[PDB]
Amino acid sequence: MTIESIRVKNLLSFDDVILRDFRDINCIIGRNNVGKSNLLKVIRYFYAKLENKKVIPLDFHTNYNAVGEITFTFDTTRIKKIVTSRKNNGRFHKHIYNTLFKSSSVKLNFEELIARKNSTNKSFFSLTLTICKDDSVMWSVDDPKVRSLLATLYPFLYIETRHIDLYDWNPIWKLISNLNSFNFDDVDHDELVNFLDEKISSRKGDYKKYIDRVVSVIDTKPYTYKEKVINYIKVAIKGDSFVNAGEELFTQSDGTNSNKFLETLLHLLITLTRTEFISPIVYIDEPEVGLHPKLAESFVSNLNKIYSKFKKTSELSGPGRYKTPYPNIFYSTHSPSILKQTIKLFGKDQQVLHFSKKKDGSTRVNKINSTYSDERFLNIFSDNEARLFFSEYIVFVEGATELELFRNLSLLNLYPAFSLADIYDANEVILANINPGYSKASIPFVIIKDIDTLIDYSIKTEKFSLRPLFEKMIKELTKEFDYYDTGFGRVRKEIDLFSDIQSSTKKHMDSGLFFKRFSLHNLSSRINKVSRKLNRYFMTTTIEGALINEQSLPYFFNWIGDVILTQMTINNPNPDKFIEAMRRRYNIKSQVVPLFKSVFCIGLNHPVYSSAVDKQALRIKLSFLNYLKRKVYSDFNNEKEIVLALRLAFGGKTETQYTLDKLRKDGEAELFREKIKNYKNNELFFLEPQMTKTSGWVTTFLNYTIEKITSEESDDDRIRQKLSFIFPEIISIIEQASSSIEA
Amino acid sequence: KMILVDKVFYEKILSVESFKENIITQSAIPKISNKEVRLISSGSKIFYAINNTSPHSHVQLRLNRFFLSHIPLNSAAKAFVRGGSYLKYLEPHIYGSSYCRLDISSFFNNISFDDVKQSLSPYIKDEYLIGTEQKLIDAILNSVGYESPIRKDKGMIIPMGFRTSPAISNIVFRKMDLLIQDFCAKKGVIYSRYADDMLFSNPRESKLLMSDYFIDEISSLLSIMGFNINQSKYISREKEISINGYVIENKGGNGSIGTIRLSKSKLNTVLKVTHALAQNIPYKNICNKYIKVRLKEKNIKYESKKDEFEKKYYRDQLINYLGGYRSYLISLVKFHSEYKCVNSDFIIQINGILNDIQNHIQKIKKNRRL
RNA sequence: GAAGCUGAGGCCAGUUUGACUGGAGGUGUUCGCCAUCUCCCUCAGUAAAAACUAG
DNA sequence: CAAGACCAATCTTTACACTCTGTGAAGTTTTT
DNA sequence: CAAGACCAATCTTTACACTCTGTGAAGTTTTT
DNA sequence: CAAGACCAATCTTTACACTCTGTGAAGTTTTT
RNA sequence: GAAGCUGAGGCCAGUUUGACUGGAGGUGUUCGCCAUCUCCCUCAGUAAAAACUAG
Numbered sequence A: 001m002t003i004e005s006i007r008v009k010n011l012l013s014f015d016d017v018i019l020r021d022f023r024d025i026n027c028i029i030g031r032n033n034v035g036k037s038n039l040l041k042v043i044r045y046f047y048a049k050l051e052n053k054k055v056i057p058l059d060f061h062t063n064y065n066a067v068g069e070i071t072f073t074f075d076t077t078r079i080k081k082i083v084t085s086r087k088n089n090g091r092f093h094k095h096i097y098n099t100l101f102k103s104s105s106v107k108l109n110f111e112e113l114i115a116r117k118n119s120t121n122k123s124f125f126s127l128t129l130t131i132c133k134d135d136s137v138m139w140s141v142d143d144p145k146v147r148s149l150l151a152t153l154y155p156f157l158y159i160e161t162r163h164i165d166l167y168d169w170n171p172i173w174k175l176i177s178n179l180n181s182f183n184f185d186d187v188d189h190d191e192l193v194n195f196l197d198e199k200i201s202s203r204k205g206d207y208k209k210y211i212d213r214v215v216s217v218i219d220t221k222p223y224t225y226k227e228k229v230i231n232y233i234k235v236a237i238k239g240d241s242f243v244n245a246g247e248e249l250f251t252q253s254d255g256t257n258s259n260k261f262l263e264t265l266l267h268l269l270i271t272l273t274r275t276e277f278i279s280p281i282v283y284i285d286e287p288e289v290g291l292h293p294k295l296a297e298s299f300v301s302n303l304n305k306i307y308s309k310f311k312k313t314s315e316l317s318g319p320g321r322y323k324t325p326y327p328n329i330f331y332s333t334h335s336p337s338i339l340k341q342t343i344k345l346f347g348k349d350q351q352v353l354h355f356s357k358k359k360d361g362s363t364r365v366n367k368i369n370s371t372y373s374d375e376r377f378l379n380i381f382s383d384n385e386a387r388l389f390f391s392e393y394i395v396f397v398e399g400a401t402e403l404e405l406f407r408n409l410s411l412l413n414l415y416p417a418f419s420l421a422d423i424y425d426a427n428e429v430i431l432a433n434i435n436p437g438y439s440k441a442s443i444p445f446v447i448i449k450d451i452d453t454l455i456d457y458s459i460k461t462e463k464f465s466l467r468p469l470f471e472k473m474i475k476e477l478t479k480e481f482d483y484y485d486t487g488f489g490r491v492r493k494e495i496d497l498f499s500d501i502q503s504s505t506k507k508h509m510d511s512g513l514f515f516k517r518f519s520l521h522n523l524s525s526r527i528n529k530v531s532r533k534l535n536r537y538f539m540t541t542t543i544e545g546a547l548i549n550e551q552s553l554p555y556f557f558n559w560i561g562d563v564i565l566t567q568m569t570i571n572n573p574n575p576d577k578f579i580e581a582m583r584r585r586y587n588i589k590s591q592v593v594p595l596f597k598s599v600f601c602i603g604l605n606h607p608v609y610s611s612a613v614d615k616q617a618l619r620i621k622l623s624f625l626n627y628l629k630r631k632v633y634s635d636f637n638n639e640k641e642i643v644l645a646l647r648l649a650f651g652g653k654t655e656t657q658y659t660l661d662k663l664r665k666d667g668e669a670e671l672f673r674e675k676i677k678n679y680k681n682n683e684l685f686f687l688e689p690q691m692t693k694t695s696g697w698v699t700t701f702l703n704y705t706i707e708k709i710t711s712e713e714s715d716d717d718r719i720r721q722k723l724s725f726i727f728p729e730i731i732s733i734i735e736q737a738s739s740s741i742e743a
Numbered sequence B: 001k002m003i004l005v006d007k008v009f010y011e012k013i014l015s016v017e018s019f020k021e022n023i024i025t026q027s028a029i030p031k032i033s034n035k036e037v038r039l040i041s042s043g044s045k046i047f048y049a050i051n052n053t054s055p056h057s058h059v060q061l062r063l064n065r066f067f068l069s070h071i072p073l074n075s076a077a078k079a080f081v082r083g084g085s086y087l088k089y090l091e092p093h094i095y096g097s098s099y100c101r102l103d104i105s106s107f108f109n110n111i112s113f114d115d116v117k118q119s120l121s122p123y124i125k126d127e128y129l130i131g132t133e134q135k136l137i138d139a140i141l142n143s144v145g146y147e148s149p150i151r152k153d154k155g156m157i158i159p160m161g162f163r164t165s166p167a168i169s170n171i172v173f174r175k176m177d178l179l180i181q182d183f184c185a186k187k188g189v190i191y192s193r194y195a196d197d198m199l200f201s202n203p204r205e206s207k208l209l210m211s212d213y214f215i216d217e218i219s220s221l222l223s224i225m226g227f228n229i230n231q232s233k234y235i236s237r238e239k240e241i242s243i244n245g246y247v248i249e250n251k252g253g254n255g256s257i258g259t260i261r262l263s264k265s266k267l268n269t270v271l272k273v274t275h276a277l278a279q280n281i282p283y284k285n286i287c288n289k290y291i292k293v294r295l296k297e298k299n300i301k302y303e304s305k306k307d308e309f310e311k312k313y314y315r316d317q318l319i320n321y322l323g324g325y326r327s328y329l330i331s332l333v334k335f336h337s338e339y340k341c342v343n344s345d346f347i348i349q350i351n352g353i354l355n356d357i358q359n360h361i362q363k364i365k366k367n368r369r370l
Numbered sequence C, G: 001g002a003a004g005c006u007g008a009g010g011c012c013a014g015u016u017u018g019a020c021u022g023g024a025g026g027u028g029u030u031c032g033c034c035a036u037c038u039c040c041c042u043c044a045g046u047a048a049a050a051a052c053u054a055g
Numbered sequence D, E, F: 001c002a003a004g005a006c007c008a009a010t011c012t013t014t015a016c017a018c019t020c021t022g023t024g025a026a027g028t029t030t031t032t
C-alpha cells in the first residue's frame, strides 16, 4: 500500500475527518459544495509545507479551536524491505536508511527487531502538521530532511481538469520527472559534448568550441535531478511537442484535447511506476469535464486495460507482469458514466467515497458499497443503476405503475422537494444485492411494497398466512437476542401479536370481498409504525387501490364524464348521414348503449363537425352520462362496492388481497365478476383499452385531477391540502420523503 | 449564524407551559427552592436532584434540547457533548511518547456563576422579560443555577446532576480550553479533556511533561477563573500510562503509532462473572457478590408472586449486565475498526470474551424457557 | 550547601572610658539614594573592547 | 537548588542486481 | 480572332573545409 | 500561597461649518 | 492558614489480655498495585450527561 490514513481536524470545511483503507482506484462523489476539492487543497498545502515552501496557512473551520491538524500515515513497509536488505548498498538507499529507518530501529532491541523482521512486516510513519492561531506551523518530527525525503518518496501529483491548458501539454514532463529514479554520476557534461562534437562536425572540435563559447558567456546554476531526467528524456525521444492523432492541438477540440492529455498522463504514470519504489499519489478533479459519455467510458476502459496489463496474480504471470503496488489514484467526478465504468471494470480494487456537508457545515466522508458478489448484476449494471449513487433519497418500488405515478410532472410541480428523490423499481434480488441498508446514513432510502408480500389471506380457509419475508423481517426485528432492556417493550409486544396473527381466523362477507370486523388499515398502520426502523413502507392495497379510494370516487367519476365528453369522435367519414342513420335505427331511450357503440369511438384526432352534429352528439352524450349514473348507482348497493369494482377492473386487489384473475381462478365472487364483465363489455367498452396497468391511465387521471382541483382552488397550500385529503396514501409517502430530504 | 434568544423564544418554545402563569401575570420567575431539590450523598460527594413534577425540571430539559445544544464548543472537550466519548479523549494520545494527566479539583463546584452569566450573555438578547423587574438572562440562569443550602456563603452554584450542568460547564470552560490548547500547541503537545480530567501527550523525545514547569504553567492558567489542580491525581509517565484501566502504549520513536488496550483489572469483574456462570453458581449469588445489585424487600411491588418475582428479577439483571458489557466491548471493537488503534492481540481477546458473553447469554435465555 | 558584598589607613563630628559609624539643603516619589530645584586628607593600584572630537 | 526552551552553517537525497522484476534464497562613559 | 488571370499537393532548407576563419589561391429531369 | 497568559461574536469608521478653507476666536463505562 | 482522604457494622486470620489491620499466586516494571500469564458476610443509599445494541 501507499497511504494508511489521512486525518484533518478543524481546517477548511472539515471538523474531524479521517480517510483510510485506500484502494487502487478511489472514486470521490458528492453534492456540489461538500468539500471534495477541500481534500485536494489540504493535501496540496500539506505537501507544499513538506518541501518548506512559503505559503499562506489554510483557514480554520471554526475559530473556537486554537489548532488545526493534518496527519499523514505513510506506509513504509516496502521501502523498509527495499533499504534494510544487504544487497541494496546504493547511495540513495543509504540515505533513506540513515534518514527514515535509522533512529527508529535504534530504539528497538534484538528480540523486537527480529520479531519485526520474521513476522509480517507492517511499518508506518505518522507525520502531523499543526497550524496555530497565529499562523505558525509546528511538526511532530523536527528533522526537515525526513520531511523532504517523505515528499520525494511519495510524490503528490495533482490536476484540476477544468483549468487545463489544452494547447500546451508541457506540465506532463514535470510529472514524469517525479516518477523514475536512476543514476547520473557516470554521465558528465564532457563525454556527452565529445560524443556530440564527434557526431556533429565536418572538422573535429568545432562543436566543442561552440559549447565552450556558450558556457563562457552565460551564468547558470547546476541542474537539479528532475531537470536532468527531463533533459535526457527530451534529447532521447523523437519529438517534444504533442500531436493528437496526427493533427495539431489547436485544430482539435477541447474535450478531445483534455481526454488525450489525461489519458497519456495516466498511462505514463502506471507504465513508469512499475520498476521503481517511488509510490505517487495522484488526484484528478473532474476527469469527465467536456467529455462525451462514450468518451468518459472509453477513458476508464483504457485506464483499466493498462492497470490489468501489468497486474500479476496467482493465475496471470510471466514477462511484463509486476507485483509493484499501484499508485493511489483519487478522482472526483460528477458523471455517472465514469463511476459506472469504474465499478464494472475494477470490482474489488475500487472504492466509492461519499462527501456530504451536514447541517452545521462539517464535511462527512462515508464509504458506499460498490462491490457486488453477483456476476449477473455486474454485467447488467447500467447507467440507471449507477445513477443511484448520486441520489439524495432513493424510493425503491416494485412495479412500473409506481414509477408512472411518482414521476408525474404535475404532481411533482406541487411538491418540488420530492423532485430531488429518484424513484427506482427494484426486484427482491436486485434490492438484496444493491444493499441499500449499508449506506442508509449516506444515502437515505425507503422500500415501498404492498402488504400482500407479507400476509396471504385465504378465502376458503379464512386464515392469514405469513410469507417468508415477514419471518425474515421479524428475525431482524427480534433484536432482544443479546441485548439489555430499553423502551422496546412495545416492539416486543408488537412482534408477539405479529406472530400470533397466524393462528387467528377472520370471517369474510359478500363471498370474500370485505372483512366483517378486521381492519386492514389498522394492521397496515401497526406494520408501518413497527417497520419504519427498517426503512420499509407497506401499503394496505395495490397502487391502483391507493389511487382509487372511496374519497376519490367523485373526481374519478368526473374524469369519466370528461372522458365521455371530449376524447371520442364519430366512427364514420360522414358524421351527418351516419348520425341520422343511427338515430333512426337505434332509439334514444331503449337502445342508447348500441347507439353510442355505433356512433362514438375513441380517437386522438378530432375532426370538426357541423353545429347541428355537435348539438346531437352533446344530447346523446348527456343522455348516456345520465344513464350510466343511474345504472352505476342502481347495480351497486353502496359506494364501497363501486370502488372495489373499479379497483378490480383496473387490476387492483380486494380487501382480502385478491385480484380479478385470482378470483376467477379460485372461482369465488361469481356475481361480482359477472357484473364487472358486463360493465366492461356493454357500457364501459370505450374504457376497455385503458383498463390495463401499462395503458397509462394513471398519468391521465393524475393530470386531469390536478388541473381540475387547481381550477377550483388557487392557493398552493390549499391545493396541497386538497391533494392530501383526496389521496391520503400517496401524499403521505411524498411528505415523508420530502421531510427526510430537508433534514 | 449564532443562536439568539428573545422574549418570544423563551415564551413560546422554551417555556411552553412551565411558566405561563408568571408571564401572563407579569410575576417574577422564582428561585429554585430547597423544596424542589433533594440532597443525595455519594462518597464524600454531594449530589443535587431536582423533582420531575417541578416546572424547573421541564424547562431545564427543553433548554438543554433547544438552546445549550447550539452554542459552539471547543473540540478539546470530549465529554457531555453530542458524539463525544471517552475513547475519543484517549485516542489523540496514541501519537505521543510521553504522557501526563492532570485533574481539576471540584470542577462543578468551582464554576463561578458570574462566569456563566458572561459566557451566556452574547447568546441571549438583553431584554426585560417581566416588566422592568427581571431580565431574560436572569430568568434563564434562575432556571439553570441553584443556591446550595449547605454552603450559603458561595451563593449561586451549578450543582452536580442538574441536567443542564454538564453543557453549561463545557460552555463556561471553553475559554480555558482555548487558552490551554493554544499554550500546548505552541509547546507542541497534544491536549484533550474529559469533564475535568485533562490529558497531555508529547510525541517528541523530551522531558517537558515530567517537569514542574508544565504543572506550574497549567496551574497559572487555571487560576485565571479560579480553578485548581488536584495534586493527588497528577501523573506523568513515559512510553506507557494507565488511565482508569485503559493503557496507552508507544514504545516507538520518530513517527510511531501507539496502541490503546484495556488491562486485566478492567476485565476482572466480567471474567469473574463468566467464571461463576460456568461454575453453575446460583443467579442470586452472582448478582449480589459481583454486580452489587440486590432486591431489597422494600422494593417488592406485589405480594401475589414473590418466589417467581425474585428469580425473574435476578435473571433480568444478569441478562442486562451481560448485554451492557457486551455493548461496552462492541463499542471498543467499533472504535478500533474506525480508527485502527487498539492492540490486535487485545482485539483477539475481546473477540473471545464477546463470544463467551454471547454464549452465556444464549444459555441463560434458553434456560429461561425451561 | 548555595547566594551576595566592598583598595589600606589617619584628624574631626555622632555611638563608646574607649573603639566603631557620616562629612548641602529643599521638594516629590515606585522609598529605589530613585528623581528634580537651588547652593574631609594621605598613600598604593589602576587590564580590555566599543561609542563619542557639538553644529 | 534545578529545569523544559540547547543558535545557524556545515558536505551529490535519487536503483541494484543473479532475479528484466523483486528488495532474497594623555580623555569621558559602559560592562566590571 | 486572341489575351493578362494557368488549381492545390507533392519530397530533410540549416556548414565546409586545406584555411580554427574565409567562401579560395422498365421511370422523371439536367448536361447533351 | 499567588501570577503574567483573561475565548470569539457582538452594532454604518468615512466632513463640519460662520470661516469656500481651517479644525476656532431495567445495562456497561467515564467525569464523580 | 492552605492541601488531601474514604458508606455503617459483624465472623475469621495477622498485631493486641484486649482492640486495631488483609482475605490467589507467578513474572516484569517507570515501584505506580502499574502491567502480563495461569487459577469473606450483612444492611442502607445509590443524581446527571455522552458514547456504545459485534459483523
Ligand SMILES: Nc1ncnc2c1ncn2[C@@H]1O[C@H](COP(=O)(O)OP(=O)(O)OP(=O)(O)O)[C@@H](O)[C@H]1O
Residues within 6 Å of the ligand: A012, A013, A030, A031, A032, A033, A034, A035, A036, A037, A038, A039, A059, A060, A061, A357
Ligand atoms: N476558507 C474556508 N473556510 C471555511 N469553509 C470553507 C473555506 N473554503 C471553502 N469552504 C467550504 O468548503 C466548501 C467549498 O466547496 P468545495 O470546493 O470544497 O466542494 P466540492 O465538492 O469540491 O465542490 P464542487 O462539487 O463544485 O467541486 C463550501 O462548503 C465552503 O463553505
